[PDB]
Amino acid sequence: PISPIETVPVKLKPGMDGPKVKQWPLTEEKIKALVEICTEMEKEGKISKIGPENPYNTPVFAIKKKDSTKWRKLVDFRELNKRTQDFWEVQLGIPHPAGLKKKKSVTVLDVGDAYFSVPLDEDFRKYTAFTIPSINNETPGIRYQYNVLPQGWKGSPAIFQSSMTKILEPFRKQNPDIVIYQYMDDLYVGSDLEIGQHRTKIEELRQHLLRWGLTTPDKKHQKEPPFLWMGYELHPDKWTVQPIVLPEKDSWTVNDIQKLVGKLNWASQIYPGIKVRQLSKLLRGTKALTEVIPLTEEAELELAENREILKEPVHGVYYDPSKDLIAEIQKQGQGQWTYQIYQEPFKNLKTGKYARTRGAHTNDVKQLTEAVQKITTESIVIWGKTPKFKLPIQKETWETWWTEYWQATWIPEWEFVNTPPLVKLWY
Amino acid sequence: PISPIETVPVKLKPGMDGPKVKQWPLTEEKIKALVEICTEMEKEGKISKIGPENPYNTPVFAIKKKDSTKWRKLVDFRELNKRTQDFWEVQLGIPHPAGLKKKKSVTVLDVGDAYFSVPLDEDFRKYTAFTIPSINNETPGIRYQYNVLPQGWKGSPAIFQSSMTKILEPFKKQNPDIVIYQYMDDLYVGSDLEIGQHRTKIEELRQHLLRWGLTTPDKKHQKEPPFLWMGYELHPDKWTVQPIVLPEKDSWTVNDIQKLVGKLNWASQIYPGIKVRQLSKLLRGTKALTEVIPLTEEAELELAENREILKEPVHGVYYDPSKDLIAEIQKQGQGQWTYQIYQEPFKNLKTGKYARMRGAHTNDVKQLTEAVQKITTESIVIWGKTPKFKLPIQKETWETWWTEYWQATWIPEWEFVNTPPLVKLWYQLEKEPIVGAETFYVDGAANRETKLGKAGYVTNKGRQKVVPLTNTTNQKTELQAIYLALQDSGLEVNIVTDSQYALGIIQAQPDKSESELVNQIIEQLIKKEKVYLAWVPAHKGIGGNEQVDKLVSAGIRK
Ligand SMILES: CC(=O)c1ccc(C)cc1N[C@H](C(N)=O)c1c(Br)cccc1Br
């Protein structure tokens, strides 16, 4: 009730005004979950219905934090954050610990509830505007303003830092070798203990928070057929880009070698220093595609050369803190996914391949959206900031089914490609 | 009178101020006309005279309009509209009848002195000033100010809507289940109560609104059953459009057709058949509207065809949240698609047509899928769920396309429905090189400056071919090449191009296109049993191709 504290004055980065992101039509099912959620949030005083005097909007969505669980609200504070958080990231910007990626295991604790306490500048409430839509435009929507720190605004966790840096003080003291990174209401705790011990020092910390700040972290475990690692574990150490493999059949049929010159060709921009001339000679004459033509001395020398030169990268590890890392995905096979996070063209900081056997989660959109989540979570761990995604998906189609398989609390910036990717190769 | 509703605080864009636009005095005639008016307007309390302490003001105008016997008042506050803040757009959407349930009875309550009763913010009242002059440069200055939502002021439309919903909340509380929809100056009360019983509630409402100051001039729930709303002809059981009259004559301009095209579009909502393909295409070449646009036999035929369909006044039904929604699709014409979503096994709910234009050289299977989504989107908005699709396309065919497409897609539950045309990937290229089959090394260039091109090929047997080409750009001839390759190959063939473009198209599995050339590449492909398209970096030294490009450029270079 009357248990608030002083607030931190927030102000839009000079230049821009309040955001006004048009709200996407939501299905009836989800609207129900939203209206409900919202009502309790009004019954709890977290948010207060607002009038027309506010022409602001931030899209809302409904998602189930866990399989077969209840609904969870999700505001798209991407825009507001950009103006508001891009100013505040240089003032309260929470530094990123590189020790997180070096360690073995990492658990991601949802600490969103906390923010639900600290009241926001009675003046900034205006921007947090979020409109719940109604079918057929019958109603212009139950507009809503936020009171406490919404679980989406990148400026919130910044404020709540005060308390968080304290709550953790004790724990950290007794557990010195555990790094605790905090990104957007996500507690990224890392360590090197044996997983057996890890599962302990995590519940330990989970039991700690719950003791001092009444920070309640949604417990999570799946003893079912779809058994996911305990505590939703990650393993930064187990991460590296080596899947690029040239066929062992490069000197068989002309067609083959032809393809070989295909891969090596484009690789010219990714790995400056590769040659192909010698190998091209072999396939220089008008011939059939199935005619077998073995390797030759000079062709062989340059194949072996490039064959390995592909394993060990060159320069490119130029992480420009200014240039935003761009993430680009490429649908490959049946259950096989591949992505590349670069800053400049062909100068990637990391590449990977998402694997989710097609069948159960057969949904292309499910696997893509799944990959979209996985590709970022790590991105957070390694660069500590969300990459801009290029998804090989139909604009309209993506926006329609992305909230359905989404189990994240943040929303990566994305744009849609509409052109056949030449990157669609064996890798 | 005036509503005792909770006002709404408005302000001007930070950095702006009350409009300082003095009014240019019209003839003393209307000057009086303004007097007689504002007077009573002030007597009602809607206004209060204040001349000095409010420097701001706007131009005040008065003239007659639209077959009426009493004077009018035109005070459009646009300058003020420029300095005033932005509001939550009253209605950011368009309500679609199809998403409405049938009511046993409905009426319309004209709430025309709507805004004039809602009081404006105690502060902003100032920024709504207007100057009343006199005759022969003699005039002390009758400056006025509104106490309610100005006739034009930007906030009016908004504030009012936000104030009405409040006005009505308590009512629908003590007496619920009576669909109330409010468009600007129109109130539509609807329910499933007998003509009388229903009108029994209407009064309860009216007097309720009489309590809140909104005096419904309509002595009763009197209104024309055939409600004309947004082109929609509405009834307690059906909906449609009607004013879709299409005139014809010689020498129609680009403007004329565009309008006619626009008309044909709207009707499609309910009338399943409207085809705007040829007419819409004729509008191509946007520039001069008054320029008479010529229609060719085809375009003319179109008009004819649609014209009769329009002759048929097809009725439209409403929705029911107990029967599962269905969506049937039919592949029509070449690049035009039509669909009908229905509840009852025979009663059209809503009808639409997907106009393929997104891109040229599109696979039909892709088109369908697109239309699918287009439908899902439009459905979601209107009703609240996704409908089950009746789709004209073999299920097993779909499984092939999705698995092999760079893009990801999703199609809810959808069953097979055999209609006239079947969605089926016509041809399809192989995966690996055919053992034995003759390999053709195609190639084509063209001196861009002279538009002179050259195509040809070279098989794995010294079979060479070349044919001169005119008015052709590099890419076009590249296709012509692959064409020649197809023309003199076998049921099983292997082709090697240097063109990124040639592969971009063919491998796209295209079927239709306004490109005879491309079409015949499809023709030849549709006939052969096995074809293997392969690409190699041009000008990098590739088997044959290296040399090919040589015999192709057997003359002028580019
Ligand atoms: C969204 C809505 O219910 C509605 C929208 C626009 C118009 C013009 C009328 C609307 N409803 C009415 C009503 N009085 O309830 C209605 C008519 Br008119 C016809 C059939 C059903 C309904 Br609910």
What do you see in this structure?
- The complex is a heterodimer of chains A (427) and B (558).
- With 427 residues, chain A is α+β, with helices and mostly antiparallel strands.
- Chain A is 33% helix and 15% strand.
- Chain A has 4 domains: 1-94 and 116-156, HIV Type 1 Reverse Transcriptase, subunit A, domain 1 (HIV Type 1 Reverse Transcriptase, Chain A, domain 1, Roll), CATH 3.10.10; 95-115 and 157-235, Reverse transcriptase/Diguanylate cyclase domain (Alpha-Beta Plaits), CATH 3.30.70; 236-319, Reverse transcriptase/Diguanylate cyclase domain (Alpha-Beta Plaits), CATH 3.30.70.270; 320-426, Alpha-Beta Plaits.
- Chain A has helices at residues 28-43, 78-88, 99-102, 112-115, 155-174, 195-212, 254-270, 277-282, 297-309, 364-382, 395-405, and strands at 47-49, 60-63, 72-75, 105-110, 130-132, 142-146, 179-183, 186-191, 233-234, 326-331, 337-344, 347-352, 388-391, 414-416.
- Chain B has 5 domains: 1-90 and 116-156, HIV Type 1 Reverse Transcriptase, subunit A, domain 1 (HIV Type 1 Reverse Transcriptase, Chain A, domain 1); 91-115 and 157-225, Alpha-Beta Plaits (2-Layer Sandwich); 226-319, Alpha-Beta Plaits (2-Layer Sandwich); 320-426, Reverse transcriptase/Diguanylate cyclase domain (Alpha-Beta Plaits, 2-Layer Sandwich); 427-558, Ribonuclease H-like superfamily/Ribonuclease H (Nucleotidyltransferase, domain 5), CATH 3.30.420.10.
- Chain B is built from 13 helices and 19 strands.
- Chains A and B meet through α1, α7, α8, α10 and α11 of A and α3, α8, β19 and α13 of B.
- (2-acetyl-5-methylanilino)(2,6-dibromophenyl)acetamide (AAA) binds at residues 95, 100, 103, 106, 179, 181, 188-190, 227, 229, 234, 236 of chain B.
- Chain B: Residues 434-557 form the RNase H type-1 domain.
- Chain B: A motif (Tryptophan repeat motif) lies at residues 398-414.
